[PDB]
Design a protein around this ligand. Structure first.
Ligand SMILES: OC[C@H]1O[C@H](O[C@H]2[C@H](O)[C@@H](O)[C@@H](O)O[C@@H]2CO)[C@H](O)[C@@H](O)[C@@H]1O
Length: 500
């Protein structure tokens, strides 16, 4: 018997491992705590039937996907243990009538601010620019937070009626997506403008935002309870308060319930159930984790009764109140992928706010991310093909990317938006292969990635004798099949069969 545990790297994995040590001491079973980057993505991908944990910790939104893919063991705690946790926390880990994980703690973002630099934190996003201009004169800045992750930007962007999927009594409608709207356009636009007006950098991420606030260089940050530990160790006298409003609308953070599920592939399901019920989810167990990095509002009633007295904890639940506990359906991964792409695309200037959000609304509504990427590539393909034929028609010349270069700058004056790279991976390029104009996607080592399912859909939607997986001079290699998978390789789609 053994237990490998996964938890994210911003959580108290050191404390959790202490708890691990106790369980080992009493049972002789080794507990290993790991914190691999992007664990919530690696888990269905390892899967987790290989180099995967017996127990996985994440916010509950990821778990419906897991359950649906059959990766999770059904948990069956007795009524007496269920009694120990707040009813609403079990609802976060209910999926299709079954319990599929143990709830641990309630996570909501708050505004964290420096009382010395900013004794009165702004109520509204709208005052951040002026606040920044003034702090800049002091060698400081107003706000830094992790821009790269939509978790952090969603509260602003969804403030005015935003949502992932509609909960019509009594179910989520997976084609009814609430990313795009007037509040989101205005919200996302505000972040882009902060960037353009040098009140924020497009590249600011978790580590950068955190180091800057804890070193007293930025007056405000946006984070969860797990971040308080490191600020305690710093010289900063910080307050934790309500997220700013925007256009009168309160921020609507998506609220996470940190949860521990059990790997369906684990031979150690029962030791895992013992570890979680009788070591972690006790006053001692959660205390050891919380001591390391604060959990937020824990699901355990007895310990939460004490934590609820913390004003930082009250601020958290105030933010959680104004927001919404995430859905846990499989389609959330597509939702987050959608918003992630949209914000980064907008913040860097790769799309307009409107185009970025129109795309997210589309991406979000797709079955899965892989399907979404293929649909996207079809759209690029369709636009480039049209443009290449329009070009060929107006100039009497076959459009081709210049030797030793990439990009479709050629049809630059023939398209609305110029596609740069495929969402399946790989920079776009126009080449000839004999008497054919061909769209090449990527290079060997910097190309596309495809599952069989993606391949099948592409072949069906684009047609036969179009898609090839290699080229030798002026002839084609193997054509794509519905069974082929591709790992980081170039791809080729004919645009014109006949350039006679
Ligand atoms: O940004 C998308 C991301 O949001 C949430 O992830 C949170 C997590 O819940 C927090 O505990 C903390 O680790 O920050 C993460 C954001 O970096 C969702 O749970 C996750 O599924 C989603 O991809």
């Amino acid at each position: 018997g053994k237990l490998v545990i996964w938890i994210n790297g911003d959580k108290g994995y050191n404390g959790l491992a202490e708890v691990g040590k106790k369980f080992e001491k009493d049972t002789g079973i080794k507990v290993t705590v790991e914190h691999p980057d992007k664990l919530e993505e690696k888990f269905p991908q390892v899967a987790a039937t290989g180099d995967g944990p017996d127990i996985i910790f994440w916010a509950h939104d990821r778990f419906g996907g897991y359950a649906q893919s059959g990766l999770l063991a059904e948990i069956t705690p007795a009524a007496a243990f269920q009694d120990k946790l707040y009813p609403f926390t079990w609802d976060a880990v209910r999926y299709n009538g079954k319990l599929i994980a143990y709830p641990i703690a309630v996570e909501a973002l708050s505004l964290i601010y420096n009382k010395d630099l900013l004794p009165n934190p702004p109520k509204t996003w709208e005052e951040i620019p002026a606040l920044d201009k003034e702090l800049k004169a002091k060698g400081k800045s107003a706000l830094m937070f992790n821009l790269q992750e939509p978790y952090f930007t969603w509260p602003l962007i969804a403030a005015d009626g935003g949502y992932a999927f509609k909960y019509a009594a009594g179910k989520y409608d997976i084609k009814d997506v609430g990313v795009d709207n007037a509040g989101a356009k205005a919200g996302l636009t505000f972040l882009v403008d902060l960037i353009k007006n040098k009140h924020m950098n497009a590249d600011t991420d978790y580590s950068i935002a955190e180091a800057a606030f804890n070193k007293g260089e930025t007056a405000m940050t946006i984070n969860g309870p797990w971040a308080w530990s490191n600020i305690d160790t710093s010289a900063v006298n910080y307050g934790v308060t309500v997220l700013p409003t925007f256009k009168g609308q309160p921020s609507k953070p998506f609220v996470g319930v940190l949860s521990a599920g059990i790997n369906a592939a684990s031979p150690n399901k029962e030791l895992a159930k013992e570890f979680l019920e009788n070591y972690l989810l006790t006053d001692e167990g959660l205390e050891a984790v919380n001591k390391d990095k604060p959990l937020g509002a824990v699901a355990l009633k007895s310990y939460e009764e004490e934590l609820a007295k913390d004003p930082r904890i009250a601020a958290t639940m105030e933010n959680a109140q104004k927001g919404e506990i995430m859905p846990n359906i499989p389609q959330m991964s597509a939702f987050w992928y959608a918003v992630r792409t949209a914000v980064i695309n907008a913040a860097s200037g790769r799309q307009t706010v409107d185009a970025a959000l129109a795309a997210a609304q589309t991406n979000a509504a797709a079955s899965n991310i892989n399907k979404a990427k293929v649909a996207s590539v079809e759209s690029d393909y369709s636009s480039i093909k049209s443009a290449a034929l329009s070009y060929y028609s107006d100039t009497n010349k076959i459009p081709v990317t210049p030797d030793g270069q990439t990009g479709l700058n050629v049809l630059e004056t023939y398209m609305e938006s110029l596609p740069d790279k495929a969402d399946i991976g790989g920079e776009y390029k126009l080449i000839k292969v004999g008497n054919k104009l061909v769209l090449q996607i990527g290079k060997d080592g910097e190309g596309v990635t495809l599952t069989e399912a993606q391949s099948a859909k592409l072949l069906s939607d684009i047609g036969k004798d179009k898609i090839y997986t290699g080229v030798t001079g002026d002839n084609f290699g193997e054509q794509l099949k519905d069974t082929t998978k591709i790992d980081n390789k170039a791809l080729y789609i004919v645009l014109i069969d006949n350039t006679v």
